């Protein structure tokens, strides 16, 4: 994984360069938003279970997928999918704190579509549940942190589609 | 299933089924007929069992249907009765299989996680299952009721 | 007026604890500071909140001190999503349509009238 600072340092180091004015620009940009990022991460850690509960209730709780024949019918499957949503929320929070989606590429999206296709998990319903989670999360953390979190939520949805 | 479980437990050790396991499979296939009869009786009396269990639950746990309770309202009460019907069906499956593998693989693994994510008190589900157990054992003979409650007790233990 | 320093709150915290609320604000209203400014006949107010030529002020005392602070927030502040069993939705997707949904044009067919 590499955060914004690591990415800037890598871009400068891969050219044998010292950190010039543009690197300082990006570094100041990250340092100004770090405190908002910490606030949002704390608030999201506070209310993870309620966020997942509300997203599931608004997205797929009463649809036909929770009915016999659906992919998430039995109790095993319901528990597995809520665990998946918890994974997505936690990794989106990591990406928001780091300011860089490389952790999502390395730890989440690598081989996820193939696993879901082998298992038979519907991708569209998953993307819609992540979109509903984006709504609740932006709601709870306010506009700026919600846009920051929605960046990585949309990153996960694009990597999954 | 008893046959399946015997086969896996013999498969891990890389041996054929010993004469004890074959004896037990034989005894199972010999009792399959009364197993099907008991499953018949429990299966086709499902409406009374679910209804009377729901009553005993709601009288023992008025909070779940009190104003705001998890099963508060027409739809939530219907959903709770739906869950009780689910578990009665699983008990019939387990009765015909001769072992709690069907009940445990469907409806017991991860049940605490699901009911915690839904906001439902698991003790209320245990109470409903106990009430359904009494109602269902009331309709069986002595030995049949003993063998049938054998599975309700396991479902209650797993749902603590 | 504002408290002079935190030692003054330590000073006046003790009359409540011994002589009740009734003896605390008994001693408070019989000070020379109260009778000097308001007497018996004037509703009290914040004295010299604004400096005259300036626009900005010094945070009026209802905003300065609400009912409870940080000490009590940890104990009786509220929360979001408190397992609280809401009134349900049953069809969240039908409420607003998607992009290619023809549900956006149902408020248009009346407009096209064969007459």
């Amino acid at each position: 994984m590499q955060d914004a600072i690591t990415s800037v340092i890598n871009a400068a180091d891969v050219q044998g360069k010292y950190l010039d004015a543009n690197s300082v620009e990006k570094l100041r940009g990250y340092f100004q938003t770090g405190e908002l990022r910490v606030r949002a991460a704390a608030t999201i850690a506070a209310n993870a279970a309620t966020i997942i509960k509300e997203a599931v209730a608004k997205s797929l709780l009463y649809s036909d997928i929770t009915r016999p024949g659906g992919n998430m019918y039995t109790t095993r499957r319901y528990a597995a999918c809520i665990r998946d949503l918890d994974y997505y929320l936690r990794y989106a929070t990591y990406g928001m704190l780091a300011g860089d989606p490389s952790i999502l590429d390395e730890r989440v999206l690598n081989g996820l579509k193939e696993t879901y296709n082998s298992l038979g998990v519907p991708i569209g319903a998953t993307i819609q549940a992540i979109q509903a989670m984006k709504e609740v999360t932006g709601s709870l953390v306010g506009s700026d942190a919600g846009k920051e979190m929605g960046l990585y939520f949309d990153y996960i949805c694009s990597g999954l589609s | 299933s008893i046959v399946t479980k015997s086969i896996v437990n013999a498969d891990a050790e890389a041996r054929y089924l010993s004469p004890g396991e074959l004896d037990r499979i034989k005894s199972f296939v010999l009792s399959g007929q009364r197993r099907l009869r008991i499953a018949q009786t429990l299966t086709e009396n499902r409406e009374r069992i679910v209804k009377q269990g729901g009553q005993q639950l709601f009288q023992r746990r008025p909070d779940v249907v009190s104003p705001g309770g998890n099963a508060y309202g027409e739809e939530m009460t219907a959903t709770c009765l739906r869950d009780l019907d689910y578990y009665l069906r699983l008990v019939t499956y387990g009765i015909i299989a001769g072992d709690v593998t069907p009940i445990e693989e469907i409806g017991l693994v991860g049940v605490k996680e699901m009911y915690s994510a839904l906001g439902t008190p698991i003790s209320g589900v245990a109470e409903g299952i106990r009430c359904m157990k009494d109602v269902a054992c009331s309709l069986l003979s002595g030995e049949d009721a003993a063998e049938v409650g054998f599975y309700f007790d396991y479902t209650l233990a797993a749902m603590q | 007026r504002d408290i002079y320093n935190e030692r003054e709150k330590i000073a006046w915290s003790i009359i409540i604890a011994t002589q009740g609320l009734e003896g605390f604000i008994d001693t408070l209203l019989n000070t020379q500071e109260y009778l000097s400014n308001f007497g018996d006949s004037i509703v009290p107010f914040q004295r010299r909140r604004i400096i005259p030529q300036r626009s900005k002020g010094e945070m009026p005392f209802n905003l300065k001190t609400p009912r409870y602070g940080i000490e009590f927030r940890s104990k009786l502040a509220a929360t979001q999503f408190s397992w609280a069993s809401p009134i349900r939705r049953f069809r969240p997707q039908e409420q607003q349509p998607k992009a290619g949904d023809p549900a956006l044009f149902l408020n248009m067919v009346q407009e096209m009238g064969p007459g």
Binding site: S63, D64, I65, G70 | - | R91, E94
Partner: peptide, 22 residues
């Protein structure tokens, strides 16, 4: 494969298609 086993064949469900009027 077990008891609670998913099959596309036996999936009568609008989870793979998002028909939200059903």
């Amino acid at each position: 494969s077990g008891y609670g086993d998913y099959s596309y064949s036996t999936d009568r469900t609008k989870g793979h298609v998002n028909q939200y009027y059903v």
